[PDB]
């Protein structure tokens, strides 16, 4: 029957039987063991969260804000098959997710794969997929009163992005295209779930109250369309939002050490590859890189490899368990510089593994007694409204931290940067 | 070359260059992968906090408790080696907790070698002795004005007791620095002042306790013919609280039912997937799980990764394991069958928990069942509840004093405080459970365990 | 047409327009010059909260749980008319308080006009009578649905209670409607979860109760064919819970000494300077300070202003109280002497305070010394400690229904929960103080107390 | 003795005797009886603290930051005696305020004696001097340590304003006098404890931590003047606190509602007098708007004054009575224009009372059959870096409330607009 479950941000959050039934898989299970924000942890000691309890969160602030929604406004008729798959598309939009969060498939695939595009969100629709498939939900789905063959659609339509190109729902419905994923200007659940939980667990002060907005909800006729805004008083609110956001990330999403302690574990990964072999179906063996291509061989693949690697035994991980401990013993790579946003033309993705190349390559006029090879130089790559903006940030990190060192590999960006035109 | 933490209970927690030294070492970074609650991830979904955080805590409440009873009373003559002695043992207190803290030692090597008695102090000590000769610290223990050769056995009396005034470390005159990070006459020391806020902030629960104010109302006295901590007549209520709210989270987050079944089930995987997992520790020998308590080396590349390296394994020999982790992951535990009223007569001991299952399963239900039960098909297990002395009342040992005669010590009783205090301090409950999951063998299961209550009259 | 209000314990609480129209008027705005602790404020500084946010926040949880009583067992037939009268009995509750909240009854009252009984509840239902008959708001109350000829009898029931089964505000299938605003059979309703929160805010005591789970398990049993709301078998130890935190708020907050003090001073003050303050009522007729509870129209003008009025006076007439008031403003206050453990005896009635100062007083030591101290200077205070029904187990008369069955329901003994629990719940306390304030007369005071107490026994 | 005072905000705070020994006269007491907010009481209910507990806190952050400051850097020779003197300048900062802190000398004073300047730092620093004069504590004061001739004009000096015009200190130590109270940029103790306390009881959430800031305490001598220069990582801090600042500012103190009722008060009050009488010294009797020349008449001037016209029986006082009636029956007066914002030309302070005779004499260029006289129409007048602005608002209002004069008002407003041309 209806389940009672803890939560330190929110109250008592209820779960359907069918969410339930969903949680209860090894593919969602999976999620205990990532960690929310992946390298950070290592920074911030008092951070050690999941994505569990982020999904959890997700799903019950989707499914709240869609009742209200509902019942302020009885002629819009949201029914409650509308609500199990809000519900259920909020719940399963992270399953994507691979290890240390975001780190992965913004720093590990590039360098590894640069021919396949990936983002997390079509291993979220891929996994949740399966995961209906193998558990066989659908019988439960047509039990409770959804349809499967619509359902489903909506769910993904949900999760990832597409004169109505969506085929899941009627025109009619816009706004539940929004709650969950809003593709238009960014404010759904979602990044409230970020806010709140990184704010308690970290240490940091918040501003915004959810709820305070939750209370002037209203779905309009704004722009010749059925669309969710805000009431004409809450532009301080808003502006609040948006300062608290710009804050967190400045604060802890952008700092030296976390940064710089991905770099090496994403090093570390990569010189560890082609060792490390994981069983998908039919006894196929699938390297870190490549076992994306099979779901059950993508779901043992969680930050245990760290482990796996540290405490290894076999020559053969010399040099990523030498990594490793590097990175235990606190004597990281030394910082080098920061050159402004790259400005005008942008970094492709599949661009990161050159710039190593490029930075060596470059002769700087002055003298430099110790001559420098490509394998010197990492570089870290970042990515920076109804009333009724970007940069690129590119770090360089030195292995050697030795005086000589970093005196010949200052000459380097000096000589590297100027000619780029940064 | 003085060093800041962020803590999300405390605030700036400051390091002395030492610590942050004595920090990195692989031997003290490995605490960063054991769970602070063990089993108790899998009930409350917002409890996943390491022992990292809680050594730092307790370090830093430890110092600054010596630091204001120093000020307070100018005349102690204490010195900066006391207080950085005092860091350090209150920082490597608990190195010796095994994978999901508390489940090992207390379910796991009772259960795997039972030819000897291991609790994680003495581990702690023995992993202190390594770090400490393997990291090569004495010469910068030196280097910073302290004595190693008298200040390593200070800081392990600290840690564990004594092993006519029996301590070696400090002189008679400094006895009120043996009751700070672990208090053997009592049970006020700061490892509760830090789990019990960690606990209630993470769990969602609130905290009914405050240290700061004690720590503004304390004294020391001469008790006894020796200088001990002492506090204020005042505040007896107060540490009386101190000790409800500590059986209330013993009751409410420490001892639930699901995740003390969760807990056996992984000490049945781990038992059944034993002799199998070998790991490497010193000159390339072999270890198991359970005899890597003899080996430093080996027993640090033993963590909670032993969940996941036996869930994700693959060889043939490790099925048994493996079918009861994917239970857990499927949620099919075990079931509830009932449980008996608390205590009365006799407490059970510890050589008569192997009995229990056997005992129950001999009970003949008066109504004919249609399913018969085995014995290996019964779990039964018992919970201790106290407050830390085993039927002793702690308050009688801490010694109180006035304000007209701040430098006397007295004594108060029970009667003298209220007349709404437990009249009883230790209990027993014992819980019964059943591993097959289908409505008749719970049935059936139910009457014999109502047949066994019954017939030794509970 | 909804409006919204911002209180700090809650949210943001929707006010209907019905209760926005009974709020702006004299006699309910009278509480915002009324403190909730009245001496509280003398020993901590931060508890300045009134009770007009009390009445609201009390108001809008018995509409919460109505709320969600009415959402979850829809064969009940709760209307929006039950919805309102009950927010507007929880809304009008406090209504009667005089100044310095509790005080003024549980002091000056009973000392004032000892030939009365007068409770702050009737008092508060004799203004409810005239608010609705002086700013016409039947007329509104029929507009939007209720029946006044009822209703208006039903928010007097739901306040101070009776006047088989005795009621008559409701049918006989909504008994449990008159469980929600104020409980007489136990002692759980949304006052004692409201002024917790509150205080424990105020303050800067931390709380533990928590009251969303237990609205989230909460249903109706049907018990002794009277619907009742009764309780999940599982809550048993957060009740006890509840109840040990009110304790502890009492002996900490309420009941503290100085507290006390000050507000026996208070009482003197006022009694000093009673027959010399002049009140106007209706009709152009004079009211004392102690009469003023006859004639609502003279007590909607009796608040906390009193105090200033007497305090800035200059009419030599009222010396006496301006002199005991400037001294209070000088903390020249009465000494604290000694205290009689618990006393062991039955108990002292009300109507037996009064010899206590000539009978500590006509005390011979056994010691000769040679200050004498007259019967005048000797004040006593008689404190009570209990958990609010007379040495009864609230939790005796709470019902529980069990997982499988919930339509029907238990009890559960004090025995089956644990062994911890008090052996008493009801105690008495007795302090004494002295007016001298030389050391002589004090010390010759603690004498005759240290005498005294010998002589009864205690 | 030492005493142990519990607060709800700082935790539990540490007496001197000294202190314990100012705190318990009437001058010191009589804070119990005035509200920080004043007449913003009756929008947010949760705003029910005096001043009492904000000067105690304010003593107490002084004394801590000044504490810290003196351990952190053993060659400034800190000397008790500066904190205490410190503490005690923390102590008596607002102890001039009279009903409801800023009604009294922002709007009440101008209208009534329009001839005389009175800030509530003269009255603070008169009532101290009484204080000490009356109370008999230069001996004790001398008990301790303190130079009474020399520790009092220090004290003074740092209350209020004075190539070293200050005399209680050489310039050597000259950044004890921005501790307290700062006029260069604006940080100090007392709008810490503002925003801390208002935050706290009106039930919103900040993003400013003060802890942070004392730890990275530190004083260098810019260009030869000793400052409290922080570090220089904290500019997204300072950035917190001064968003912090303005959204509370446009939240809380400029609600119409507070603004409207202050006035009407105000109103109500200038009626009122002429017939409250206080008495002073040698039986002399005071007005409230004289009672400013009279230390001992002004002790006993609080918020009692409001219920005196309240409660009163006399019938010269009918007209107070009925306004405030008004007040509590919440028949307010209208929001009728809502004036432009500044437009540089400033009023000046003693010119308020002359307005609203200004409006009336304004002739619209529509048919405005009805005649309304001055007296029906009422204004209120608004207010708006070392690393080691100002606009006023004009707001409208009516007496009356029928529809007929809300047509006939607006038409003045418009028309007094574009007369004075804002
Ligand atoms: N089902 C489930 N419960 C969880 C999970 N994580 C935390 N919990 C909590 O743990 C509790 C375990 O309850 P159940 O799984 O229902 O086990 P039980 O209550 O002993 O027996 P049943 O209710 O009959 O299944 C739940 O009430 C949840 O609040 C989870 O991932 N799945
Ligand atoms: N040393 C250390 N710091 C930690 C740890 N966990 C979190 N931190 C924080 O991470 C920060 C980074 O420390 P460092 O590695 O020394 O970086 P850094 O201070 O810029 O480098 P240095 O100036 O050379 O010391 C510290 O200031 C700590 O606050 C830990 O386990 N060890
Ligand atoms: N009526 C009323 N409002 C209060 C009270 N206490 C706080 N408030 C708040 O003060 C605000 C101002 O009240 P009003 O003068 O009625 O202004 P309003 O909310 O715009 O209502 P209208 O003027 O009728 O449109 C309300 O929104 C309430 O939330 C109170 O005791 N009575
Ligand atoms: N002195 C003083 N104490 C206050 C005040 N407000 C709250 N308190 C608290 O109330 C307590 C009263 O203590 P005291 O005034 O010292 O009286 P006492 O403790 O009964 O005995 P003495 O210390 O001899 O005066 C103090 O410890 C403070 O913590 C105040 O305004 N002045
Ligand atoms: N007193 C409590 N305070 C806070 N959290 C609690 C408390 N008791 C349990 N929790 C946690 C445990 C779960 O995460 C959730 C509620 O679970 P709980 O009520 O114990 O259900 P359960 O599965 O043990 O029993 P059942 O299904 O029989 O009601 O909150
Ligand atoms: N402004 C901030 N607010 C909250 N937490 C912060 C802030 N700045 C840093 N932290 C966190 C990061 C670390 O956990 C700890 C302090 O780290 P930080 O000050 O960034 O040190 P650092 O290694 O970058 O530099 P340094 O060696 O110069 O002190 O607190
Ligand atoms: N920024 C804020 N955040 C939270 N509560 C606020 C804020 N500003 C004001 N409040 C308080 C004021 C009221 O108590 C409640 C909301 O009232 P508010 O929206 O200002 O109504 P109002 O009477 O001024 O206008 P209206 O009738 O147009 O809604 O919250
Ligand atoms: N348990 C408590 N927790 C927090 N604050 C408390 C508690 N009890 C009292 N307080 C408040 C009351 C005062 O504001 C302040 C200190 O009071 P307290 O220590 O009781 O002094 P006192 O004057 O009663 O005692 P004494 O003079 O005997 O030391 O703390
Ligand atoms: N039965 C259990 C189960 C788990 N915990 C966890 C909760 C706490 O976070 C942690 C306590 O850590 P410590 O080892 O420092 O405290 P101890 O209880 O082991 O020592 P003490 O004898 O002082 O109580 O153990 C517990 O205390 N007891
Ligand atoms: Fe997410
Ligand atoms: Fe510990
Ligand atoms: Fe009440
Ligand atoms: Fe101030
Ligand atoms: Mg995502
Ligand atoms: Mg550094
Ligand atoms: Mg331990
Ligand atoms: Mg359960
Ligand atoms: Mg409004
Ligand atoms: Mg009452
Ligand atoms: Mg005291
Ligand atoms: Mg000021």
């Known amino acids: 029957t209806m389940k009672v479950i803890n939560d330190p941000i929110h109250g008592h959050i209820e779960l359907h039987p069918l969410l339930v039934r969903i949680i209860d898989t090894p593919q969602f ?5 990532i960690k929310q924000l992946g390298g950070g942890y290592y920074v911030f000691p008092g951070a050690s969260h999941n994505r569990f309890e982020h999904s959890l969160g997700v799903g019950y602030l989707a499914g709240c804000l869609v009742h209200a929604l509902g019942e302020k406004q009885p002629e819009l008729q949201i029914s409650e098959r509308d609500v199990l798959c ?10 994507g997710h691979g290890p240390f969060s975001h780190m992965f498939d913004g720093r590990f695939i590039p360098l590894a794969r640069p021919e396949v595009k990936w983002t997390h969100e079509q291993g979220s629709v891929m996994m949740f997929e399966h995961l209906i498939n193998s558990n066989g ?9 959804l349809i499967p063959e619509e359902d489903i659609c909506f769910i993904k339509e949900q999760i990832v992005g597409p004169l109505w190109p969506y085929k899941g729902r009627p025109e009619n419905k816009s706004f539940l295209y929004e709650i969950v994923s809003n593709k238009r200007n960014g404010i759904d659940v979602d990044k409230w779930d970020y806010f709140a939980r990184d704010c308690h667990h970290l240490g940091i002060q918040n501003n915004f109250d959810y709820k305070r907005f939750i209370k002037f909800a209203r779905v309009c006729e704004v722009d010749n369309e059925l669309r969710i805004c805000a009431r004409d008083k809450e532009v301080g609110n808003l502006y609040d939002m948006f300062h608290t956001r710009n ?3 400045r604060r802890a999403y952008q700092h030296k050490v976390g940064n710089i302690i991905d770099t090496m574990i994403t090093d570390a990964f990569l010189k560890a590859d082609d060792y490390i072999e994981i069983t998908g179906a039919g006894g196929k063996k699938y390297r870190i890189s490549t076992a994306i291509d099979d779901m059950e061989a993508y779901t043992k693949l969680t930050d245990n490899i760290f482990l796996e690697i540290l405490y290894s035994t076999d020559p053969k991980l010399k040099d990523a368990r030498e990594i490793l401990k590097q990175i235990e013993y606190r004597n ?14 942008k970094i492709k993705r599949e661009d990161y593994e050159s710039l190593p190349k490029e930075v060596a390559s470059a002769k700087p006029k002055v003298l430099l007694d110790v001559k420098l090879k490509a394998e010197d130089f990492i570089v870290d790559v970042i990515n920076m409204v109804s009333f009724y903006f970007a940069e690129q940030l590119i770090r360089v990190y030195c292995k050697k931290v030795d005086r000589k060192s970093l005196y010949a590999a200052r000459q380097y960006f000096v000589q590297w940067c100027a000619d780029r035109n940064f």
């Open 332 to 345: 990281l790579f030394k910082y080098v510089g920061e050159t402004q946003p790259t400005g005008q033309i």
């Open 137 to 145: 939900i659908k019988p439960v789905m047509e039990q409770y009163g």
């Open 86 to 95: 809000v519900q259920i598309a909020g719940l399963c939009h992270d399953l």
């Open 247 to 249: 804050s967190l990330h």
């Open 29 to 33: 299970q999976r999620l205990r063991y």
